[PDB]
């Protein structure tokens, strides 16, 4: 729990289309993405995520 956190902007073309929700799912990273809600989510961690950019990692969009 120190290294491995080298992420960046996900590849939008790598996402496939989920018809039920109407949004993108990327099999390679396991990321969910909606350009409208602008939030991501990684189901491998089961976390609703958000690309900060500065932290170079996916921060949970679980604002409480």
């Amino acid at each position: 729990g120190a290294m491995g956190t080298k992420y960046a902007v996900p590849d939008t073309s790598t996402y496939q289309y989920d018809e039920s929700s109407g949004y993108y799912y990327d099999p390679t990273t396991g990321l969910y993405y909606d350009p409208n809600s602008q939030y991501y989510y990684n189901s491998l961690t089961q976390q609703y995520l958000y690309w900060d950019g500065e932290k170079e990692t996916y921060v949970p969009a679980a604002e409480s």
Partner: peptide, 11 residues
Amino acid sequence: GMRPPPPGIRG
């Protein structure tokens, strides 16, 4: 149900 859904899931 399962994991969460893709961002949105509106109506």
